[PDB]
Amino acid sequence: QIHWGNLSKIGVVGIGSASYKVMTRSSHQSLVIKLMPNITLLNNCTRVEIAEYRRLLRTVLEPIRDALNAMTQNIRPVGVVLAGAALGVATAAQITAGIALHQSMLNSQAIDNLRASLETTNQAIEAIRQAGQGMILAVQGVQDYINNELIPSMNQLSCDLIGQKLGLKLLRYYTEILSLFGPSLRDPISAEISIQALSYALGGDINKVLEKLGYSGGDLLGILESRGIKARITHVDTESYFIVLSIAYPTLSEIKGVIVHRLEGVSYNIGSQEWYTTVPKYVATQGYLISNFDESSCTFMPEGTVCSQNALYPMSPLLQECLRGSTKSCARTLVSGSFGNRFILSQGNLIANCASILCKCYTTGTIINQDPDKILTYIAADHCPVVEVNGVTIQVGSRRYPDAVYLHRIDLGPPISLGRLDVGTNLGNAIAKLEDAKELLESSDQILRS
Amino acid sequence: QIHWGNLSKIGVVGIGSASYKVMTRSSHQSLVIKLMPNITLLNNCTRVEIAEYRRLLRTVLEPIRDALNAMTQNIRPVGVVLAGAALGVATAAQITAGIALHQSMLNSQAIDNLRASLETTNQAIEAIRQAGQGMILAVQGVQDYINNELIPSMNQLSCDLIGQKLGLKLLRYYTEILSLFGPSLRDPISAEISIQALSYALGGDINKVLEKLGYSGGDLLGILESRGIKARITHVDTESYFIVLSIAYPTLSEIKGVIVHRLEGVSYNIGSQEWYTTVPKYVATQGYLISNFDESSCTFMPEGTVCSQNALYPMSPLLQECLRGSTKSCARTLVSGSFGNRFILSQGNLIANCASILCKCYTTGTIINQDPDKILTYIAADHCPVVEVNGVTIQVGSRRYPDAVYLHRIDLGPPISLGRLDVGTNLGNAIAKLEDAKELLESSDQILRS
Amino acid sequence: QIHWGNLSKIGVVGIGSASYKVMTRSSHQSLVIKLMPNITLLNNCTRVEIAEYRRLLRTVLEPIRDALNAMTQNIRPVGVVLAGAALGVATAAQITAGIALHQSMLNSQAIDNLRASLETTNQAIEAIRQAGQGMILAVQGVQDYINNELIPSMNQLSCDLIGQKLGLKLLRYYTEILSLFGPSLRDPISAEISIQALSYALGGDINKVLEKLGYSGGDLLGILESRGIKARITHVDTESYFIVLSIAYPTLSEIKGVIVHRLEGVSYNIGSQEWYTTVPKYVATQGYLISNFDESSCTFMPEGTVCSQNALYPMSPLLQECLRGSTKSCARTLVSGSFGNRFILSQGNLIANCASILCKCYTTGTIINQDPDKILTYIAADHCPVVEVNGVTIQVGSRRYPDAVYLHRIDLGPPISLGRLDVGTNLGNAIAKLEDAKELLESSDQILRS
Ligand SMILES: *[C@@H]1O[C@H](CO)[C@@H](O[C@@H]2O[C@H](CO)[C@@H](O)[C@H](O)[C@H]2NC(C)=O)[C@H](O)[C@H]1NC(C)=O
Ligand SMILES: *[C@@H]1O[C@H](CO)[C@@H](O[C@@H]2O[C@H](CO)[C@@H](O)[C@H](O)[C@H]2NC(C)=O)[C@H](O)[C@H]1NC(C)=O
Ligand SMILES: *[C@@H]1O[C@H](CO)[C@@H](O[C@@H]2O[C@H](CO)[C@@H](O)[C@H](O)[C@H]2NC(C)=O)[C@H](O)[C@H]1NC(C)=O
Ligand SMILES: *[C@@H]1O[C@H](CO)[C@@H](O[C@@H]2O[C@H](CO)[C@@H](O)[C@H](O)[C@H]2NC(C)=O)[C@H](O)[C@H]1NC(C)=O
Ligand SMILES: *[C@@H]1O[C@H](CO)[C@@H](O[C@@H]2O[C@H](CO)[C@@H](O)[C@H](O)[C@H]2NC(C)=O)[C@H](O)[C@H]1NC(C)=O
Ligand SMILES: *[C@@H]1O[C@H](CO)[C@@H](O[C@@H]2O[C@H](CO)[C@@H](O)[C@H](O)[C@H]2NC(C)=O)[C@H](O)[C@H]1NC(C)=O
Ligand SMILES: *[C@@H]1O[C@H](CO)[C@@H](O)[C@H](O)[C@H]1NC(C)=O
Ligand SMILES: *[C@@H]1O[C@H](CO)[C@@H](O)[C@H](O)[C@H]1NC(C)=O
Ligand SMILES: *[C@@H]1O[C@H](CO)[C@@H](O)[C@H](O)[C@H]1NC(C)=O
C-alpha cells in the first residue's frame, strides 16, 4: 500500500525489505546460582571474609524471599485460583507472572534434595541430576578463582593472604548481586532478566552455561543478540544462600503478511535551499495496513528481522497518508551545510541532488545541470551510462524512474523542526493564536448561517 | 484532588501510593586518593613504568589544579566575599560551590602534614588520624595488587617481569583517572561525583570504603541506590600526586503533605478499535496541587520513595484538569495488536476489556459479554464470585466500582500519537492551517462587531 | 545578530563563547588484530580450548568476510568505477566507504607476507616492518596473560590447569569479539569504530597502542575525548584468523566566523509565580545566521570546542527571532518549588530574582525589595557595592545592565510545558479545535467579503 512512485518524487526510496519473526517459549529449564563457594581445601583461612560475605547477602535476599511469599500465599488450587480480594491490587503482568511462579515452583521435597546436592559440589558449573526430574544446572561465581588460583598456592602463601585474596573477590561479587537483585529490581515477581545481564553472577562469561543448557543452533546468535534468552526468579533460599531461576530458549515464528521496509532519503533543492523529507527509518506493512516499527529489540539477520518484543505500534493517520502517496502530508526539514545524503543508488539508477553536488557525465565529459524548476535528477543509462556524482564513478543501468517533473506538479508538505525546544516554541505560539481566536471559533455556526 | 471515580471510567486506576523523602547533607568527611603506590619492597624493578605513569598523570592533574586556584583566588575574608568584578561571570551553582570549596578545604599547613602521612603508608585503605582533627581516609588504587600478587612473587619472577606486570595495572588505572577527571569533566568546581563512579579509582569496590567512613544503617541501600553519596574535589596536589575529595552521607527528610501516586491503565474498546488513555506513570499531590514526578533519581523503598534530586516538576494545566475528573481533557492513543494491559485487579474487583479478551464466569460457566455501547466491564462478586479473564482464574470481592455506564455518558478526549515524528508531522499540518487562516484570525474583531 | 540587551530583560545571558573546530583525515595506518595467540611454550596443554576458540570465531568472521567481498566484487578499474546495476541499491555513505575499502585494500601478495609475519611473533604489541610499505601494528589480545602468568608457571602448575586458565580467558575474549563484530554490527563496510570501543580487543588498554601508532601531541586528549580516532574494517582472514583495520589520527581545522555561545538563565517573577525562559543550552552564530549546536560529539577545551561530527543543525525561524530580540517569540515555563537558578553573575553585575530570594545590601544592611511591577533586579556598585543574595556575599562592579523596566514594557511569550506527555495532550487539544473549525477555516474569502 506504500506508493513508491510518489515517494521517490520527494527523494524517498526503500533500500531493503525483510520478514518479521517473533519469539515464543514452551520449555523452561532451572538454573541455580550457588552463592556459597566450596572452601573445604582452604583450611579455615577465609573464615572472617566468608562470614562478612554472608551477612551482606542477607540484606539483599530477605526482601526478595518476602516478595515471592507474598504472591504465592494468595494462590490456591481451584488449576489454581488467585485470592483477588486478599491481593487487592495487581496488574495483568503481575497476575500472570504470579501464576507461573506458583506453577513453575520446585516442590518442597525437591528443595531439600537440591540443598544437599549443592553442598557436595566444588565446581564452577555442574549439572545436578535428580531421578525422574529435569536436569538442574548449578553455577558458583567464584569457584573457578578458588580452584585455579587459591588452592594451588596453599603451600606457598600465608593463611592471612589467602583470606584477603578471596575477600576481595567476595566483596566484588556481592556488589554485582546487589546490582542485579537489590532495591533497583522493581517487582521481582514479574522481572525478566536477560542471560547477558547475569554474566558476572555466572562467573563472568555465559558461553559454558549456554553449552550446558543445550542452547545451540543456527538461530542462537540472532536470539542472543536480541536479548531473547530471559530468566525469572522462582525461589530464594536465605538459609543455604542460593537463588533458583527459570530460563527458556525461545522458538522463532514468522508472522504471515508482515513486511519490514527500510526507508532512506536524499535531499532536494528549492532554489537555493536544501530540504529533506521526514519519514521513519523503518515501517511495517500487512496488506493495506501501515504501521511504525520499533527496532530497539530487533536484530536484522540475513534471513529476517528477529525481535524479542512486539515491534509493531500504530502510526498516525496523517503519516500513513504521506506513505500512501500524499506528498503534501509529508513534512520536510532543512539540513545542515554539510549533508551526506545528497545521492542514492536505487534499482540501478542514481537519484541525486545535482544542485548541491557536481553531477558529471563521464561518458561525454559534460556537467549535468539540475533545472531550477526541478528538485531532483534521475540518472539512468539512456542519458549517461557512466556518471561521476561526488567524485565517485558509477555505472548505471536502464531507466527505472521517470525523468524529473517540475516543482509545480509536486505538492510539498509543511516545513517543521523536530527538536524538543523547537517543537515547544512553535506549539506554544500556535496554542496562543487559538486561545486568542476562541470567541471567533466558538461562534462558528452563527457565522456559517450568514 | 485526583478524581479516581472519573478516571476509572476511562480505565485509569492507582496501584500504590508512597511518601516522598529528600536528602540533606550536614557533615562532610575527607577522602584522599593516593595516586602513587608504595613500591619499596619491589626494589626499583618498576622504575621506568612508574616514571611513565607520573608523566601521564600530570597532563590530567594540572588543568584541575589551575581551575581550583582560579576560583579560590577571588574569595577573600569579608565571613568571605566573592570578588564578582574580578570573576566576571558565574552561575549560582558555581558561586555556591566555590564558597564551599574555600571553606571546606584543608589549610596549607595541614597539606604538608597530609603529604608526610601519605608517604609512610603501604596499605590500600588506611585512616590518617591527626592530633585534633577529623579522620582522613587514604585510598591507594593498585596497592592491593602489589601486596597480594607482586611482593610474594619477588623471589620467583625476574625484575623485568615485575615491572611489566605493574606497568599493565598502572596504565589501566590511569585510563580510569582520565575518564573521571580528564577533559570530560565540565566545571570541576561544581562537579558532584557519586561514590559508585569512583569505584575503580578506589580499587574496584566501595564496600570497605563505606565501612571505614562509618556509613551504615537501615537507609544505606536506598541512599546508595539513589546515588545519594556524592564527592566533590577540594584539592589537587601535582607534586605528591594525590587528590582530596569531600564526601557526605545524607540524611533523609520526608516532605509533609506530598503523596506519590503510581498510575496504571487498562485499554478499552470503541466498536472494533482498542484505545488507551495517556497518563503519566507517576504523579504527585500536595493538597489541591497536582504535579509531575520524575523517578529517574528515586528508589522506591517499602517505607517510601527516596530521591537524591528534586523529583517534582510542574504539570500542564490541561493535564491537571484531566486528573481532576475532566475526561475530555485526557488524550487517548491506539494500541498494538498484542496489548498486555487488558485487565487489572483494583480494590478486589476486576476492570477488564471484555471485548478484547474472553471474560467467563467460572461459577456458572457462562461467557461475560461486553455490550457495544460500553467500553469496559467491572466485575465484582455480586455478578461472578470467581471469574476467568485470560485463562487465569481469579476470585473477586464485593463491589467497589459502579456498573459500566454507556459510552454516550462519557466524554472522551482527542486521539493522539506520541511518537517524535508523528508529533512533528501533525504539528506542521496544524501550523500550516493556522498560517493559511491568518487574515480571518487577525480580523476577528470586525467579524464580531456584526 | 543575537540581541543580548533584550534577552537580559527576560533573564537570559551568555556565560562564555568559543571557537569551533572540526576533524579531517589525511593519512591512514593499518592495525591488525591477531586473534590466534602464540602458545608454543605451553606444550599443547591448551589444545582443546584453542580448538573450541577457533570454532566460535568462525561463526563471527565468516559473515563479515562475505560482506566485504560482496562490495569489492562490484568495483573494477575505470581510477575505479562501481557497477551500480549489479549492486542495485546503496546509500552514498556505503558507496563512499566501498571505494575507500577497494583503495585501502592490502594487495593479495601483501596478505601472504602479512600472514607469515604474524605467525613468527609472540608479543602482545609488535610493529611489522614490511619492506617498501608502511609499518603495520599487530596486537594480540591474550598474549600478555600467556607471557606474564602462564609461561612462568609451567613448571609449577598441572597441564590440565594451564588449559583451564587459558580457556577462561579465550572465552571472555571471544565474547568481546562477538560484541564488536557480531550481528549487532550492521553494514561492516561503512562502520566506524572508535579506538575506545576496541580497548578490550586490544588487550584492555589503548595507551601503548597510541604510543606505537605515533599518535601524540597537545590535541590528543581533546581528540580522544570526542572519539575522533576511528577504525574501519579493510580485511578479514578466516584461514589465519586476523582482522585488518584502517585507523586515522585526525587534524583539527577551525571554521572561520563560527562562534559557539553558552546560554544561562535566571528565573523571574510575575506576581507570585516563578517563570523561566526556554532557550537552548548552546547556540552558534556565523555572521547573521543563527543555528542550533549539538554538543554530543564535542569536547570544550580551553582553546575551543573540538567536535568529531558536524555540530551545527538548523534552528526554527520562530526561535531565531526570539534570539534576535523578539521577547514575545520566546516561550516560558513554570519551575519547581526548589529552583537553583535564581541569580547569576554577569559582567560584574548580579541579575537576581529578588522576589524569590532574599536580596540585601551588605554595605548598608537594608533589604533589597523587588517591586511587583518588575520581574528582575540588576545590582551594580552604584546602588550596592557589596551585596548578599542567597547567603553569599558578593562584591559587584560598575553598571553594565540598565535598571529593570516595568513589566508592561516587556512583551512575554506563551507559557509551555516541554514534557513528552504534556506536549501530546496539548497538541491533541489544539488539533481537535482546528478540526472542529474546519468549515469556518475554509471559508475565508466569503467571510471577509461581507
Ligand atoms: C566440597 O568439595 C569436596 C571435594 O573437594 C566435596 O567432597 C566430596 O563429596 C562427595 C559427595 O557426593 C563425595 O562423593 C566425594 O568423594 C567427596 N570428595 C572428597 C575429596 O572428599 C564436599 O562435599 C564439598 N562440600 C563441602 C561442604 O566440603
Ligand atoms: C501523487 O502526487 C500527486 C502530486 O502531488 C497527487 O496529485 C494531487 O492529487 C490531489 C487529489 O488527491 C489534487 O487535488 C492535487 O491537485 C494533485 N496535485 C498535483 C497534481 O500536483 C496524487 O494524488 C498523488 N497520488 C496518490 C495516489 O496519492
Ligand atoms: C612504604 O611502606 C613502608 C613499610 O612497608 C614504610 O616504612 C614504614 O614507615 C613508618 C613511618 O611511620 C614506620 O613506622 C614503619 O616502621 C616503616 N616500616 C618499615 C618496614 O620500615 C615506608 O615509609 C613507605 N614508603 C615510603 C617511601 O616512605
Ligand atoms: C466526570 O465526567 C463526566 C462525564 O464526562 C463529566 O460530566 C460533564 O460535565 C460537563 C461540565 O463539567 C458537562 O458540560 C458535560 O455535558 C458532562 N458530560 C457528560 C455528562 O457526559 C463530569 O463533569 C466529570 N466530573 C468532574 C468532577 O470533573
Ligand atoms: C612463537 O614465538 C616463538 C618465540 O617464543 C617464535 O620463534 C621465534 O621466531 C623468530 C622469527 O622467525 C626467530 O627469529 C626466533 O629465533 C624464534 N625463537 C625461538 C625460540 O625459536 C615463533 O616463531 C612464534 N610462532 C610460533 C607459531 O611458534
Ligand atoms: C526588544 O523588546 C521590546 C519589548 O518587548 C520590543 O518592542 C516591541 O516592538 C514591537 C515591534 O517589533 C512593537 O510592536 C511592540 O509594541 C514593542 N513592545 C513593547 C515596547 O513592549 C523591541 O522591538 C525589541 N527589540 C528588538 C530589536 O527586537
Ligand atoms: C575448620 O574447618 C572445618 C570444616 O568446616 C570445621 O569443622 C572446623 O571447626 C574448622 N576449625 C576451626 C575454624 O578452627
Ligand atoms: C629505586 O626505586 C626505589 C623505589 O622505592 C627508590 O626508593 C630508590 O631510590 C631507587 N633507587 C635505588 C638505587 O634503589
Ligand atoms: C605436546 O607437547 C609434548 C611436551 O612433552 C610433546 O612431547 C608432544 O610431542 C607435543 N605434541 C604435539 C602433537 O605437538
PDB file of C-alpha atoms in Angstrom, chain A residues 14-15 144 148-149 152 203-205 207-208 211 221 224-225 264 281-282 299-301 334-336 338 340 343-348 362 386 392-395 397 417 420-429 431-432 434 438 440-441 444 447-448, chain C residues 52 59 78 80-85 87-92 95 99 145 157 161 164-165 168 171-172 174-175 178 183-184 186 278-280 292 310 312-316 318-319 329 331 414 416 418 423 426-427 430 433-434 437 439-440 443 447:
ATOM      1  CA  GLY A  14      13.273   1.762   0.037  1.00  0.00           C
ATOM      2  CA  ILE A  15      16.676   0.129   0.443  1.00  0.00           C
ATOM      3  CA  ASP A 144      36.978 -21.032  39.368  1.00  0.00           C
ATOM      4  CA  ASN A 148      42.590 -22.271  39.736  1.00  0.00           C
ATOM      5  CA  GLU A 149      44.367 -19.623  41.832  1.00  0.00           C
ATOM      6  CA  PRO A 152      47.341 -24.433  44.136  1.00  0.00           C
ATOM      7  CA  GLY A 203      31.415 -16.310  36.647  1.00  0.00           C
ATOM      8  CA  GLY A 204      31.935 -13.563  34.059  1.00  0.00           C
ATOM      9  CA  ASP A 205      31.002 -15.472  30.888  1.00  0.00           C
ATOM     10  CA  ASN A 207      29.352 -19.438  26.783  1.00  0.00           C
ATOM     11  CA  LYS A 208      29.772 -22.512  29.003  1.00  0.00           C
ATOM     12  CA  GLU A 211      26.519 -25.114  26.184  1.00  0.00           C
ATOM     13  CA  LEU A 221      23.383 -15.572  17.574  1.00  0.00           C
ATOM     14  CA  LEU A 224      21.204 -13.873  21.806  1.00  0.00           C
ATOM     15  CA  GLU A 225      21.761 -10.503  20.104  1.00  0.00           C
ATOM     16  CA  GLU A 264      16.245   6.093   3.017  1.00  0.00           C
ATOM     17  CA  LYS A 281      13.649   4.728   9.324  1.00  0.00           C
ATOM     18  CA  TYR A 282      11.572   1.519   9.358  1.00  0.00           C
ATOM     19  CA  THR A 299      18.350  -7.909  15.138  1.00  0.00           C
ATOM     20  CA  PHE A 300      18.481  -7.773  11.333  1.00  0.00           C
ATOM     21  CA  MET A 301      19.684 -11.213  10.280  1.00  0.00           C
ATOM     22  CA  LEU A 334      16.145  21.966   6.442  1.00  0.00           C
ATOM     23  CA  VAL A 335      19.565  20.323   6.548  1.00  0.00           C
ATOM     24  CA  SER A 336      22.937  21.487   7.821  1.00  0.00           C
ATOM     25  CA  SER A 338      27.409  19.508   5.283  1.00  0.00           C
ATOM     26  CA  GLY A 340      25.771  13.455   3.499  1.00  0.00           C
ATOM     27  CA  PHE A 343      22.533  10.967  -3.777  1.00  0.00           C
ATOM     28  CA  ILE A 344      21.461   7.328  -3.651  1.00  0.00           C
ATOM     29  CA  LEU A 345      21.655   4.261  -5.879  1.00  0.00           C
ATOM     30  CA  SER A 346      18.211   2.694  -6.296  1.00  0.00           C
ATOM     31  CA  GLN A 347      17.176  -0.049  -8.741  1.00  0.00           C
ATOM     32  CA  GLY A 348      20.335   0.573 -10.760  1.00  0.00           C
ATOM     33  CA  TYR A 362      31.804  10.554 -17.562  1.00  0.00           C
ATOM     34  CA  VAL A 386      28.831   6.143 -16.547  1.00  0.00           C
ATOM     35  CA  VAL A 392      32.748   8.645  -7.418  1.00  0.00           C
ATOM     36  CA  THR A 393      32.492   6.970 -10.822  1.00  0.00           C
ATOM     37  CA  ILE A 394      29.358   4.823 -11.120  1.00  0.00           C
ATOM     38  CA  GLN A 395      27.851   2.780 -13.949  1.00  0.00           C
ATOM     39  CA  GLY A 397      21.523   0.553 -15.737  1.00  0.00           C
ATOM     40  CA  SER A 417      11.701  21.470  13.163  1.00  0.00           C
ATOM     41  CA  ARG A 420      12.370  19.293  21.557  1.00  0.00           C
ATOM     42  CA  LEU A 421      12.708  23.033  22.174  1.00  0.00           C
ATOM     43  CA  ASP A 422      11.713  23.999  18.626  1.00  0.00           C
ATOM     44  CA  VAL A 423       8.530  21.928  18.990  1.00  0.00           C
ATOM     45  CA  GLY A 424       7.739  23.584  22.317  1.00  0.00           C
ATOM     46  CA  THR A 425       8.348  27.100  20.998  1.00  0.00           C
ATOM     47  CA  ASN A 426       6.215  26.619  17.878  1.00  0.00           C
ATOM     48  CA  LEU A 427       3.443  24.732  19.697  1.00  0.00           C
ATOM     49  CA  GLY A 428       3.108  27.465  22.323  1.00  0.00           C
ATOM     50  CA  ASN A 429       2.833  30.067  19.570  1.00  0.00           C
ATOM     51  CA  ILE A 431      -1.837  27.488  21.114  1.00  0.00           C
ATOM     52  CA  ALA A 432      -1.682  31.232  21.808  1.00  0.00           C
ATOM     53  CA  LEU A 434      -6.032  29.501  19.041  1.00  0.00           C
ATOM     54  CA  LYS A 438     -11.640  31.392  20.859  1.00  0.00           C
ATOM     55  CA  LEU A 440     -14.376  33.651  16.701  1.00  0.00           C
ATOM     56  CA  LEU A 441     -14.090  29.851  16.741  1.00  0.00           C
ATOM     57  CA  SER A 444     -18.751  29.085  14.011  1.00  0.00           C
ATOM     58  CA  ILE A 447     -21.070  32.844  11.202  1.00  0.00           C
ATOM     59  CA  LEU A 448     -21.888  29.940   8.870  1.00  0.00           C
TER      60      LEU A 448
ATOM     61  CA  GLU C  52      36.874 -24.503  20.661  1.00  0.00           C
ATOM     62  CA  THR C  59      30.755 -18.057  13.215  1.00  0.00           C
ATOM     63  CA  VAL C  78      37.778   2.542 -14.792  1.00  0.00           C
ATOM     64  CA  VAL C  80      37.755   2.683 -10.379  1.00  0.00           C
ATOM     65  CA  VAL C  81      34.058   2.506 -11.231  1.00  0.00           C
ATOM     66  CA  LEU C  82      31.155   0.959  -9.324  1.00  0.00           C
ATOM     67  CA  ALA C  83      28.866  -1.488 -11.140  1.00  0.00           C
ATOM     68  CA  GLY C  84      25.683   0.163  -9.927  1.00  0.00           C
ATOM     69  CA  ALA C  85      23.381  -2.115 -11.914  1.00  0.00           C
ATOM     70  CA  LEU C  87      24.969  -3.544  -6.850  1.00  0.00           C
ATOM     71  CA  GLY C  88      21.399  -2.320  -7.341  1.00  0.00           C
ATOM     72  CA  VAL C  89      20.816  -0.299  -4.163  1.00  0.00           C
ATOM     73  CA  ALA C  90      23.268   1.535  -1.889  1.00  0.00           C
ATOM     74  CA  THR C  91      23.464   4.742   0.125  1.00  0.00           C
ATOM     75  CA  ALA C  92      26.056   7.445  -0.500  1.00  0.00           C
ATOM     76  CA  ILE C  95      29.281   3.817  -1.815  1.00  0.00           C
ATOM     77  CA  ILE C  99      35.542   2.977  -2.708  1.00  0.00           C
ATOM     78  CA  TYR C 145      48.394 -13.094  30.053  1.00  0.00           C
ATOM     79  CA  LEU C 157      51.049 -25.994  37.536  1.00  0.00           C
ATOM     80  CA  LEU C 161      45.255 -26.423  34.915  1.00  0.00           C
ATOM     81  CA  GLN C 164      41.627 -24.347  32.128  1.00  0.00           C
ATOM     82  CA  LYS C 165      43.120 -20.934  32.939  1.00  0.00           C
ATOM     83  CA  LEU C 168      38.569 -18.884  30.637  1.00  0.00           C
ATOM     84  CA  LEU C 171      36.005 -17.423  26.045  1.00  0.00           C
ATOM     85  CA  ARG C 172      35.945 -13.924  27.552  1.00  0.00           C
ATOM     86  CA  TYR C 174      35.544 -14.192  22.188  1.00  0.00           C
ATOM     87  CA  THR C 175      32.584 -12.561  23.949  1.00  0.00           C
ATOM     88  CA  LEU C 178      31.160 -11.145  19.286  1.00  0.00           C
ATOM     89  CA  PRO C 183      25.263  -9.418  14.334  1.00  0.00           C
ATOM     90  CA  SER C 184      24.877  -6.088  16.160  1.00  0.00           C
ATOM     91  CA  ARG C 186      25.091  -3.915  10.633  1.00  0.00           C
ATOM     92  CA  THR C 278      13.190  28.351  27.472  1.00  0.00           C
ATOM     93  CA  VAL C 279      16.291  28.673  25.260  1.00  0.00           C
ATOM     94  CA  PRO C 280      18.903  26.199  24.006  1.00  0.00           C
ATOM     95  CA  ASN C 292      21.444  25.172  16.965  1.00  0.00           C
ATOM     96  CA  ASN C 310      29.114  18.197  12.423  1.00  0.00           C
ATOM     97  CA  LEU C 312      25.566  22.691  13.515  1.00  0.00           C
ATOM     98  CA  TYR C 313      21.948  21.975  12.621  1.00  0.00           C
ATOM     99  CA  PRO C 314      19.145  24.376  11.663  1.00  0.00           C
ATOM    100  CA  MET C 315      17.059  26.328  14.168  1.00  0.00           C
ATOM    101  CA  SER C 316      13.387  27.090  13.589  1.00  0.00           C
ATOM    102  CA  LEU C 318      10.485  31.459  15.403  1.00  0.00           C
ATOM    103  CA  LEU C 319      13.277  30.535  17.829  1.00  0.00           C
ATOM    104  CA  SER C 329       8.614  34.839  20.444  1.00  0.00           C
ATOM    105  CA  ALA C 331       8.464  30.640  25.299  1.00  0.00           C
ATOM    106  CA  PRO C 414       3.490  31.872  25.572  1.00  0.00           C
ATOM    107  CA  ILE C 416       4.513  25.947  27.526  1.00  0.00           C
ATOM    108  CA  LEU C 418       8.067  20.619  27.406  1.00  0.00           C
ATOM    109  CA  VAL C 423       3.076  18.092  24.506  1.00  0.00           C
ATOM    110  CA  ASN C 426      -1.961  19.965  24.414  1.00  0.00           C
ATOM    111  CA  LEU C 427      -1.271  19.227  20.735  1.00  0.00           C
ATOM    112  CA  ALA C 430      -5.290  22.088  19.616  1.00  0.00           C
ATOM    113  CA  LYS C 433     -10.169  22.705  17.918  1.00  0.00           C
ATOM    114  CA  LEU C 434      -8.836  23.179  14.378  1.00  0.00           C
ATOM    115  CA  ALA C 437     -13.498  24.764  12.968  1.00  0.00           C
ATOM    116  CA  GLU C 439     -15.727  24.502   7.764  1.00  0.00           C
ATOM    117  CA  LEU C 440     -15.189  28.044   9.052  1.00  0.00           C
ATOM    118  CA  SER C 443     -14.416  29.918   4.069  1.00  0.00           C
ATOM    119  CA  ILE C 447     -16.323  35.759   5.453  1.00  0.00           C
TER     120      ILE C 447
END
